[PDB]
Amino acid sequence: DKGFINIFPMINTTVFVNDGENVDLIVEYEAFPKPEHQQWIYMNRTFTDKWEDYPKSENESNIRYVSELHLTRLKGTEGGTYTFLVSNSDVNAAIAFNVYVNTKPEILIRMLQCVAAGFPEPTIDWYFCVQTLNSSGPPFGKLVVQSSICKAYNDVGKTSAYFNF
Amino acid sequence: DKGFINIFPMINTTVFVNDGENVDLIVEYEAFPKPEHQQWIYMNRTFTDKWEDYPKSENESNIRYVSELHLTRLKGTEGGTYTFLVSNSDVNAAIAFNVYVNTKPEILIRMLQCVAAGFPEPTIDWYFCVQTLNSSGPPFGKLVVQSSICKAYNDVGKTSAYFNF
Ligand SMILES: *[C@@H]1O[C@H](CO)[C@@H](O)[C@H](O)[C@H]1NC(C)=O
Ligand SMILES: *[C@@H]1O[C@H](CO)[C@@H](O)[C@H](O)[C@H]1NC(C)=O
Ligand SMILES: [Co+2]
Ligand SMILES: [Co+2]
Ligand SMILES: [Co+2]
Ligand SMILES: [Co+2]
Secondary structure: OOOEEEEEEOOOOEEEEEOOOOEEEEEEEEEEOOOEEEEEEEOOEEOOOOEEEEEOOOOOOOOEEEEEEEEOOOOHHHOEEEEEEEEOOOOEEEEEEEEEEEEEEEEEEOOOOEEEEEEOOOEEEOOOOOEOOOOOOOOOOOEEEEEOOOEEEEOOEEEEOEEOO | OOOEEEEEEOOOOEEEEEOOOOEEEEEEEEEEOOOEEEEEEEOOEEOOOOEEEEEOOOOOOOOEEEEEEEEOOOOHHHOEEEEEEEEOOOOEEEEEEEEEEEEEEEEEEOOOOEEEEEEOOOEEEOOOOOEOOOOOOOOOOOEEEEEOOOEEEEOOEEEEOEEOO
């Protein structure tokens, strides 16, 4: 047999984190020969000092290794796929984590239009006393919904605003 | 000496309750002769079954009495002065409780105008990427402030909304 790299996640690959909280993406993996070019990537951007790598055993015959990425104070926009890559002289290997960041809806108004953004997808109710877009600027949220006929909410929170003529 | 009614509060007369929470307004009082016409009043409205009255002692020579008003699920609008009255054949006596209900700001928008309402008095900040009125209808809050130049907040919460042209 030749070289090999086998990766096992220590936590579930799909993780859910509340807005402003932390999460540690942990991976164990066996490799021969000595693993090289350990790397954590999010959005073509490489984390320089937010992660750590170390052998699981001090013993010389160890081929078990651990890599951890420390995500701190995650924002709703910082949700997405975080990828870990590693290689040796023979094999290239990778594993991916899907990080969801729960956020309460942010609503804006520009005949006005009410637009809610966040995760999970905010639903809009109207009380008396629908399309989907994807924008970078305000309001800041993973999923964006506009309702026309303003209260907005999801399983993590609610946001309201009144409008009169 | 003739008749007398002396009232002592068992809790502080000024009470602060968060929105949606409960509070028990408790009063002890000594009276001779037998107290009569015990009454709890808020906004000219008399609580019929939300309160209880009972002698502090079963013994016959007791002149000590207790009256409790159970306020449940208080709203921001339900903040104000709650009054307890009691009398006998000689004296009339009363005591008053000042109930504050903390609420996060509610903001509305009608050249638009942003109006925040709640308790304590909401302050308005503007981020780039003042008068005072008193209305019954939306937005619902004890103190109302309009700022013109929309984020709004107080020591109990915050509420935001964007506006673009
Ligand atoms: C995914 O991870 C969660 C914990 O965040 C766990 O409750 C769930 O069972 C996992 N799903 C699997 C292992 O299929
Ligand atoms: C008023 O009541 C509060 C408790 O709600 C207490 O902390 C405060 O000391 C009281 N003020 C007095 C007794 O003057
Ligand atoms: Co380091
Ligand atoms: Co949808
Ligand atoms: Co009763
Ligand atoms: Co003021």
